[PDB]
Each structure stands twice: as C-alpha cells, then as structure tokens.
C-alpha cells in the first residue's frame, strides 16, 4: 500500500521515520509521495497540519495518522514507543476510518480563492479598524467591530477557539463556529458576544464597510488579501479521515490535553 | 381540529385568548385541553414553557404555537396584532412543522426520575459545596468544583447558557451544551473550563463525591432531589414541533432579541 | 505575649497545635483565646477565615499567621515543617506588620446589620429571580438581573472573584470590588458586564425591585435575610493585620497558588 | 490665559472650533499652541488622545477639555451646544482641576526608549507566535503564550481593556492593569487568566524568549519595535490634568457610555 511520512525534522524525528520505513521495507508497501493512500506526521500538530495541507487535493484517497514527538500533540495518536507496533498494524491493515469535518473558505475580490482548513480560518484587518458586515444565510446579523473573527472546525475548537471562549464540540457533528476577538460594545457598537455554531449548508459571509484589505489566515498560514469585497464561510463537503486503529475517544483526548495526563 | 389556549393570564393575554377562541369558533375547531393537537401559548416564554411541560405526554401529537405578550418572548412568533391572521392561517392549516431537540435528565436514587426539558436542566448543590464527578460514556473528565453546571438544549442556548458563556447553536443540530457556573481554578482543582458541546446518543453523568443532595431545575422548576446517585444527560429521542407558517429565521430571532429590532 | 492557636481539628493540626503550645511554654507567652494579641491558624484558608470572624471585634490589638494544614492555603505563610522556627521568631517577636483591607456590608430592613468580610459578600435571591437596582454614590448606575452579585476585598479577589472573571488585585490598594453572577443580556435586560473597582469612600447600594428576601453571605457564612431595603458595601475603615517574619510577596503567593509550586 | 484647540477636522468641528475662538476674542485669552495652559478638544476620544500627545512633555503645565462632536466620546464633557457656556466658565476661569493617572512604557533594546499612555499599551509579535516572560518586581510570575497583552490606565480601562474582559477601574485609583489577550492554556502552557491590577511603583517587566520583535501600541499609535529586550511598564509619576466646571461623576460617565443615555 502507498504511504509517505513527513517528519518535523528534528533529530528524533528524522530517526523515527528512517526506522519507520526500514519497518516498512519488510512489508508490501510503497513509499510514494506523490499518490500515498496513507500519510503518516511525525512532530507535532504543526507538522500534522502541514501533512493535511501537502494533501488537500486528494483528501478522498488518505487516511492520517499523526505521531507525537512535539509538545501537545492533539492530532496525534501514537507515542514513539509504539511506532514498531504502528507499522505492523498499518501492514495487513483492514483499520477502520474516522471522518472530521473541514471548513471551506471563500475569498472573493474586486474587478474567487477558496481555501480548506483542518482548525480553522481567522480575518483581522490590515493594521486599521476591523469592521465587517456580518451576513448569515443572506440575512444582516450584526456589524462586528474589534480585532478580528475565527471560524473554526469541529477539531479546531480545542485550538485558538478555545482560548477565544468557544465551545469544544465533538468532531461527529458537521458544523462550524464563529468566536469574537475583542469585540467593542458600548451604546453605539454591539455584537453578540456569544459564540455562534452553523450546520451544513449555512453560509456565513462577512463583507467589508470601509477598509478593504484584510489578513485572512487558514490554519498555520496568513495571507494579506486585497481588494476583498467578501470572505464567505461553510462547512466544506470534504472531510479528513483518519486512520484508527485502538479506540482514544476525542473526550478522552480533550482530557489528555486539558486536564492531567 | 382540536386545540387549546394558555394564557399568561393578565387582561391583555386572557382577553386576545377570548377573542382568538370567538374567532375559532367560525371554523371546525373543537376547543379541548385534553388531546389538543394545537397548543397556542399566549405570554412570554414562562408562559411558553408552562404549556409544554403542560403536554410533554403527547408532544408527538402536538404543534405549538407562541404569541407575545410578555417581555422578550423568545419562543413567540407571532405579535398579538396578527392574532386573526394566526387564526384564519391555523384554520385551513396544512401548514409547516419544524421540531427542535430536547434534553432528556434521569436522576437515579440510592435504594429513578426523567425529566424533559427545552431549555435546560441545572444542578447546584442544596447549601454546602458543589463537586461532582463528570463522567462522559463511562470515561471520567474531570470533577467538577464550583457554584453548579448547566446542560442546555439548543434553543435553550439563548437562555441560561447564554449567561454562562455558552455558544449560541442552531436548533438543527441534535445536541446538548454543558456549561459550568463558577469553578475554582488553582493548582489544586482543574476544570475544562469551555462549553461542551455533546452529539446524540453522548451521556454525560455526573456522580457526587461528599454531599449527594442536589437541587435540579429543568427549565422553570427546581426541586431539591435527596440520596442522588447520579444524574445522567442525554439528547431526548423526542422533540417538540413547532407549527410554522411564515419564515422567521432562528438566526434572525437571534438578532431580533439581542442585537437589535 | 498573648495568643492563642486555632485548629481545623483534624489529627495533624491538633498535634502541631499541642507542640507549637509546649514550644511556647519555653518562652514568655501566655496562652489567651480571650485577648491573644497574636492568633495562629492552623488549616487551611477556611480555618483562618473562621479565626478572622472568631476576634473581628479585636482586629486592632491582634497579628495574625496562618499555618497550611489544609490543600491550597492562600492566607497561609508556613508548612507545618517551619513550626518551631516561628515559635522561635514570634517569641523574641519585633516583626513586622502588614495590613489588607477590609468590606463592610450593611444590611438595612423595613419596619440595620453590619459585616466584615475578609473575602468577599455575596447576594443571591432567595428562590425567586434575583433583580436589583445597583446605586452607586446615589447615582442610578444599572438594574442587575441574574444570579446574583459579589463584592470582594483586593485579598478576596483570588478567590470567589476569580472564579466570577474579577481581576487580581494587590491587597496594598485600598478597594472592593464587584463582579456579576450570570447577568442577563438582550435587547430588554442590560448590565455593565465588566467587574467594577471602587476606590475607598465610594458607596455601593443595593436595592430591591420586587422580592424583599436574600441570601447574603460574607466570607464562609450565608444568611436568609428578610423584608431587605438596601444592602451597602463600602471599604471598610478596620483591617486586618498579618505577622510577617520574611518576605513572600503577593504576587509570588499568587504565581505558587495559581501556576506552579 | 493661553488656550489651543484641536479639531477632529471635519466640517461640524472645524466650526465650532472657529467660534469659540471668536468667542475667546472678547476675553483676556490668547491663543498659543506652542505654551498652552488650555487645551481645547473638539471631536472623539480619539481627537482627544491625539491631543493629549501633542502636549505631553507639559501635562503639569495644562488642563484639558474635550468636547464631543464624534460617536461616543468618553473623555468628552461637553456637547458642541454648551460650547459658549464653556468659553464663558472657561473666561473667569477658577474651575477646579481632576487629575487621571498615567502609564509609562519603557522599551529596551539589544546593543531606551519610553511612551506615556492615556489609555494603554499592548504588546504583539511581528508575524511569529508571542511568547514572553511576565516578570513582576523581579519575580518570575508567568510565561504568556498568546496573541499579546495590554496594560490599561484606570481611564483606559474602559476601552480595549474592557473588550479583554478587564475590570473597570475608577480614575482615582493609582493603578494599572493587565489582560490577556487569547492565551494558551493546556497541560503544557498555563497563564494566569485573569486581569492583574498593580499598584504605584510595581513595575512589570516582559522578556522575550525566542523572537525579539515586537509590535508595541500605545494609545493609537502601534510600531514595529526589533531587537527587544525587555518592556517594562510602571505607573507614571505623570498626571493629566482636565479642567471640570460641573459634576460628571466617572460612575454616570460609565453609566451613559454602556448602560443607556
Ligand atoms: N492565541 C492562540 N491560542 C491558541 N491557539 C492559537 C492561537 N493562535 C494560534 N493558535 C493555533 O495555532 C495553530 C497553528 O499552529 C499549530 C497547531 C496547533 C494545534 N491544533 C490544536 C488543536 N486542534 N487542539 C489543540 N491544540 C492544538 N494545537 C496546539 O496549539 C498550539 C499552537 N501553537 S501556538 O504557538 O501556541 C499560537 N500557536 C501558533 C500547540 O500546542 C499545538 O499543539 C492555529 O491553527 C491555531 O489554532
Ligand atoms: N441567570 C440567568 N440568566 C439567564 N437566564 C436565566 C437565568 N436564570 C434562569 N434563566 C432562564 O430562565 C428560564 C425560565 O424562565 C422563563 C424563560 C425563558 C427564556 N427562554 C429563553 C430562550 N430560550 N432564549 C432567550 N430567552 C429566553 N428566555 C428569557 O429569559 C428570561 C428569563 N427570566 S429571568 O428572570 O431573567 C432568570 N430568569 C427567570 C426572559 O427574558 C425570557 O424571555 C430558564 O429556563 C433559564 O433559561
Ligand atoms: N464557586 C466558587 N469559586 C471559588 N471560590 C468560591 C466559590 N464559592 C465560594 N468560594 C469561596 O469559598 C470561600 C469559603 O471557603 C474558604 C476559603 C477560601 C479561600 N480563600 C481564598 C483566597 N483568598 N484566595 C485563594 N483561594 C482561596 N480560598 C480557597 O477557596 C477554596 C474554597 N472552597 S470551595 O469549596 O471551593 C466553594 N468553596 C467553599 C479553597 O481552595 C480555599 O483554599 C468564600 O469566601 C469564597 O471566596
Ligand atoms: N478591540 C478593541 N476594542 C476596544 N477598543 C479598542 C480595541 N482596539 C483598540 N481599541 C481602542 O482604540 C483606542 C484608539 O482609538 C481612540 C479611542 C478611544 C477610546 N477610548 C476610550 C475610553 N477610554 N473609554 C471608552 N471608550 C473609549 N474609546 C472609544 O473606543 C472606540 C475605539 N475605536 S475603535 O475603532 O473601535 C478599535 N478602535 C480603534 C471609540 O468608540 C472611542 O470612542 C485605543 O486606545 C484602544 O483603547
């Protein structure tokens, strides 16, 4: 079977995944970059975020799996200790597959770019005021002044959602979920405040009032956008899946993370 | 068709009832508060909830139906100025039902009780300190330190939960929000700290550690509970169905309560 | 000199109490729970609490020091392992003093009350819905609706204020300190929100806008009070003196509780 | 007496800019905009924080005034209709002045430079993740790990502070504060949370600990600062001065800007 490892390309890292795939040497499997049907990340969520954006484009035919040799690690399921018995269970496979949900992103400009991401895309403005138009399903739900808006997956509200006040939700449910940075409320200016959580096929879209330059991130990248006339939001028809082969409940990893491990 | 009025019961709310009942009587609908198969609650969202806990025995034969007037009215689609146009519409029917999740709550006792509820079911100690373990399908999270917790419906996610720094979530998604009020954070005591956010089919349990009365409110109600074992929440396979007959966006009432109207 | 010896009671502080006695017998002290001019707490933070409201009448004459027994011991300056070294450094004395300041809530009905609080005072309704008009140096400030309110002294605000999202500040500032308990926020209902800081000599008033009954704690205890007018809170002119032999500021006191120790 | 006047700049202001100076011209009031004793605001509060950097090397010399023809106007007194009622209270003068605390910003570099803030000063990294060390009286307190931070005057603490989650703060308190803005906490990275309010002459210092460019605000006014080495904030020993002709407690201020008015 096709496979590939990236590597954070550190000195343990780079050593895991030779021995990896000398492992593998001993089985029927391929190591092919170019059309893998299995990716494997060895670093940490940085690195596993990488290997899902290396592959986006053919996100139908992968299965994931993330090995933790960074600090957190919650995309990861396998320590190093158990890579040997990793390559043994990935060989003769017959593993079973989870899906996430993923969040599309729209970027439309003056006189279309879209964009997937596994935790989720931020919009902060080009150094002035941040002020949007914030439109859901067609229908003109607030005017957000602050320092900026998240819109984050499933899997992605553990991450910078979190630290911004959103809810953790479990990655079975297809939905995204909007967070506030910082927003202005006083007599003139309101926003919800709250968090607010989409399904499928609601669109949130955020149109510009003045300054039309803004800093859309997705995932680890940041990319100046000019000359935006709309950033548009929905859960994508794309989904990662991973491969699995013990069972590590999401809540149990959010207790791994969160609580004492 | 057979239905019923609640009222909040001050002159304003009796006399619309009276007056919608008059004009119900030109067409073929029986008044009966046994089997109704329309519930119209006319108040506020008290009034609202009263109604369904009224009939939480037959809500798959029922459709409600809210008129405000009272303060905010959340659950209320109609102003009390459309109140004859509700009644030629309800009349003639074939009208659309849309259904919103409940929370199902099961208290079980030393040597068990269910509760529905559409917005939420809460549990504050009955004096002393709260702490109770959070269990999670038969997984230990975290236990819990603080003033109580709040389990919410969707729709109830505007509500209590709201307060408590909850996310806002479309009634769509078949779900329940854990939100905590008050935990102690030190070196000592941990907790998660973020809404949850469950799918269907997810149990949460919470199982008491010292103390084990509790005073459990489900909505409007609260009731000291003694010798609890557990309390254990759950998305109820029931649902309540709404009798619909223009569009009011959830995200739109959203906004018409809090950002603006 | 005068002192006395408070104990949580349990087997471990009991038999530290017994020795730092026999230590001090070595010594010219004398044994006087009636008016010790020192007063040894031997828990945790809720055992010097109850020493603290034991001589609230004395707080001039008397130095207090806390002893950890307990788990997180805030107002705590010793392990038990430092025992006979401040047996030692008390006799012989000429430590120094430092002071923190104190809440004074007054409590007035229809047809007055006062408190000292080390910690905090908290108002809840007494089943009902907690609704009161906040009146800030005779000025209307806002109608609070929710929860209920606390008031804490700058050492109290690592604890219940804390919890309630109130700002850490050093006991050396001579202020109270107001946090919301679940306010309700929408187009009818508005509150500040944010916690507010009030300096000494400005006065924050309560009042009743329909219910007249409340549960008000201060510190440790909390009361059913009755046919409520008015609660004060203002900065109280009495505070609370600690015996401090070496230097363990407030802000490490706070890293070692909160981050790590 | 020697008086200046800002002007937001736009047709209303300008105006009433240019009456007021013919109405000064039938008084003993010169017009000076290098010496100053008066300084005249006209526009919003970011007229005003402009204002006040124009004069800061002679705040002991120089009362303030704002009045407001911008949206919301905190540091505003004054509506533009009470304008020739202030030239004549301002004319015979013997007004009483209010002094507000100040913040100072001490930036270090490799191989100093310090600001004044009316408001606050934050503190983000330039493009890569922030990461600095909080040293508090030389006590190593935390390592924030975040998107920044933001250290607020009493007066400012109604502004970014407040979108924070900061406290609000009378002005009379010699103080500053700090909040956090989206930290990281997990089992591996903890922050305090909440807000710090420091007294006079705590000095908190941040240190770098991988990257050493920072992007430094103070007030409106953000710059790319390299080579840090340390920041270090301190109340100031300077004070603003503002001119005040009637009672508009900072209570009711709050109270108009936030509750209603
Ligand atoms: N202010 C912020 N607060 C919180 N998160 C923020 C903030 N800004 C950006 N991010 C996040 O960074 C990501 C990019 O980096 C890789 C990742 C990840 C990552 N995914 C997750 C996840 N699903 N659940 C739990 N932890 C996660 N991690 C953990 O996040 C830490 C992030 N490293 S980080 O340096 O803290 C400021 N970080 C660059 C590590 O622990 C990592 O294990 C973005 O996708 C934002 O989600
Ligand atoms: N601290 C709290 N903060 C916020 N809500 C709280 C708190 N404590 C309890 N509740 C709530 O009360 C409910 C019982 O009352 C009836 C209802 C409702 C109600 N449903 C909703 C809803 N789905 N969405 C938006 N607003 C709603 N309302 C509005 O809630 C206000 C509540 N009246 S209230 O007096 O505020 C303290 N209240 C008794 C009214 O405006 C009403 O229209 C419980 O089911 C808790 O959800
Ligand atoms: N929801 C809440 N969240 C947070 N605190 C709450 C809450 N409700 C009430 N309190 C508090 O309880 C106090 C009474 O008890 C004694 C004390 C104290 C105490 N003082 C402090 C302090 N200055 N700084 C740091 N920690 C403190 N402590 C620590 O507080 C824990 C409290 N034990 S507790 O059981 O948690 C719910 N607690 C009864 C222990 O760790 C103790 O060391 C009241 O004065 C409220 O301030
Ligand atoms: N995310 C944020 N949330 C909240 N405030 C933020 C944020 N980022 C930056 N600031 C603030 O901007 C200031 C610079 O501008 C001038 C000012 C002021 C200003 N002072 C105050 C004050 N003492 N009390 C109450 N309101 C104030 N204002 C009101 O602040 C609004 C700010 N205009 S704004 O565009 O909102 C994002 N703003 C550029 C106006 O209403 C103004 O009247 C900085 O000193 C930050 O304090």
Known sequence: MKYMITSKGDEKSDLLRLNMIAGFGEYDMEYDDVEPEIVISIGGDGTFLSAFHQYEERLDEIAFIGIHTGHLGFYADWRPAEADKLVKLLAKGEYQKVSYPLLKTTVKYGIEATYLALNESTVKSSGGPFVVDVVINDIHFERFRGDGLCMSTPSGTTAYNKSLGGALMH??????????????????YRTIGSPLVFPKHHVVSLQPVNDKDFQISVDHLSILHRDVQEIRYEVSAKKIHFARFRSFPFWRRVHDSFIED
């Open 171 to 188: 990655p079975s449910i297809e939905a995204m979920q909007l967070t506030e940075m910082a927003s202005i409320n006083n007599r003139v």
